[PDB]
Design a protein around this ligand. Structure first.
Ligand SMILES: O=C([O-])c1ccc[nH]1
Ligand SMILES: O=C([O-])c1ccc[nH]1
Lengths: 353, 357
């Protein structure tokens, strides 16, 4: 138990969510964003040992739990992946809400049907609900999150990528992370496992180039000023779904889930274009066939605050409240071990350059 | 309904070895090759759930433990990976020996500096030794395994791969698994991290073509009749090593370790060619810079039993016994769970199958 961490290993519809429940020292920071920055700046080897081979792998994802800081929250959470720390994550939020109830972190009131679980994240407060299985104490049927405010940021941004991709037109939207949203048709490849390595490559190229050429800034959270995810979308395979997508992020890893923050950013974009009404269910499919359900539950304009998309004819920037629903499973309870003489105590990747 | 398995998650110089220690269903079989066959044929969903995403991944490896059957063994063991089931595995044997002593599966005698751990495998009896740290009862510094007999099987086999590989010449050798051994240079790829996808692809196509064109058969073990592994070798980077290799196997996964059966195979080949002598240390490097040490312990002719390399005038085939030494670490104690309603209770891969047109 020398250097050890305890993990609730979960997945949300195929996407990993390794929830680290114990093992950290005190992490300085007066909010969750500072605690994230502390880990990144001072203890990044932890993320690497927990996320990467041999203990993890190139498409691993997870989070560290903390005591809540913000008033009203049940749990503090910092997300991590193979390349860095996202400000929010829908699939891991869904998993954390589920684990909080299944493992007893949060109590179930007698005869409750739904149990609130509020997450204090680097992007803000995420209000979750675990929907209980009919005849049970704490068995979770599925879980919903009300995301932090999402918004379209900038439209029809032309990004110049090298051959074979060339010029590509994207939207930038915020769904807890900044996304570039791009039709797969523009990249000349369809969403499939056959194309997954090219989709990864195309997503890395796109992210790199837009962060070079376009400076983004969340108007309410100064620390959010990069595009961290690329959402590549196209026509659905499952007739229950409106669209399919794959999100590329981290060290060009791919989300196996439909991506909760990416679903929020998509819904905000569609809502801004008049294509979704309040309460309307949007169903996003993943590369694996997984589904998430979203609804926009509210909109607001914020006078005197604008983003590049905001027209002069509008009073202020449009933001929306998105709810995302999906299902997570506990797939293990792990005690992770780090022997000081282990040459890969800090993990490794064989992913090309 | 709900299933759980306990795992000791290990790695051997970067290569996973997920050792399942309890929670398996009860499996028939009168030997470990039959238990492997029973799993393969009737309960392959266990391997898939345990090896593949989301609980594993495309380069995961492991083993199930059983009661020993063969006289003299401490543990029965069946190996598994992302494609199927290898008859032997050096790195996972080194991991099992290590874990056996470190977790008290086997006891350490009074003031012992070395502890035997014998494994009953689908390839035969593998005699291992945990080498202990100085002032400890059960801390392991490294572990050595004496493999089942290895041998060169067939020499200079030419097979034609698709473009861009074309015709390639290889040796077929048994080191607990049958290997095709090829120089990276013949494939026109350097062994490097940058080239790992290409190495995987060439390894898959070579394994497939070899099995199509050359029908192998272990002369003492009827159930071993395919080439399951491809060993691609080249010049060392570490000046302590003789060579560097990557082994492609499973669903074209790659060994991050130097590969213990592939070292045995390589040593049996070099030995057959007069390039390595009994007791001489051979050091093999992996793509990660990991090292294993190997030594030929002995040779033997088996009268009236021949393989293709055996000469008309030679009265029986040559076999060698190799010992391999490496180090394993415990990386996790895991309780792995499978909800009947989980659509990924049996795992998934996003790796695409490939084949020659
Ligand atoms: O669900 C999400 O928001 C997510 C982000 C990256 C991977 N999944
Ligand atoms: O060490 C070995 O023998 C091995 C075989 C496949 C992967 N590692």
């Amino acid at each position: 138990f020398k250097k050890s961490f305890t993990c609730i290993d979960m997945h949300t519809e195929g996407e990993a969510a390794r929830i680290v429940t114990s093992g950290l020292p005190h992490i300085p920071g007066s909010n969750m964003a500072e605690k994230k920055a502390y880990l990144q700046e001072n203890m990044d080897y932890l993320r690497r040992g927990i996320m990467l081979e041999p203990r993890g792998h190139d498409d691993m994802f997870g989070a560290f739990l903390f005591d809540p800081i913000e008033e009203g929250a049940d749990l503090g959470i910092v997300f991590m992946d193979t390349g860095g720390y996202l400000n929010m994550c829908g699939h891991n939020s869904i998993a954390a809400v589920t684990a909080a109830v299944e493992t007893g972190i949060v109590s179930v009131p007698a005869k409750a049907t739904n149990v609130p679980v509020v997450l204090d994240t680097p992007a803000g407060l995420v209000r979750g609900t675990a929907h209980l299985q009919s005849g049970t104490e704490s068995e979770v049927s599925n879980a919903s999150i009300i995301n932090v405010p999402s918004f379209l940021y900038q439209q029809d941004v032309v990004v110049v990528l090298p051959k074979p991709y060339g010029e590509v037109r994207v939207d930038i939207a915020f769904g807890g992370n900044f996304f570039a949203i791009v039709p797969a048709e523009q990249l000349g490849i369809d969403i499939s496992v056959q194309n997954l390595s090219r989709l990864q490559e195309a997503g890395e190229l796109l992210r790199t180039e837009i962060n070079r050429s376009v400076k983004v800034q969340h108007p309410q959270l100064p620390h959010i000023n990069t595009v961290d995810c690329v959402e590549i979308y196209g026509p659905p395979t499952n007739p229950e779904a409106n669209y399919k997508n794959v999100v590329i992020f981290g060290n060009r890893q791919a989300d196996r889930s439909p991506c909760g923050t990416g679903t929020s950013a998509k819904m905000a974009t569609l809502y801004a274009k008049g294509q979704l009404r309040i309460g309307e269910t949007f169903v996003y499919e993943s590369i694996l066939g997984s589904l998430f359900q979203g609804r926009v539950l509210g909109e607001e304009r914020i006078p005197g605050v604008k983003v590049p998309v905001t027209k002069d004819a509008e009073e202020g920037m449009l933001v929306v409240t998105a709810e995302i629903t999906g299902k997570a499973f506990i797939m293990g309870f792990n005690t992770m071990l780090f022997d000081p003489t282990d040459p890969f105590k800090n993990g490794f990747t064989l992913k090309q350059y």
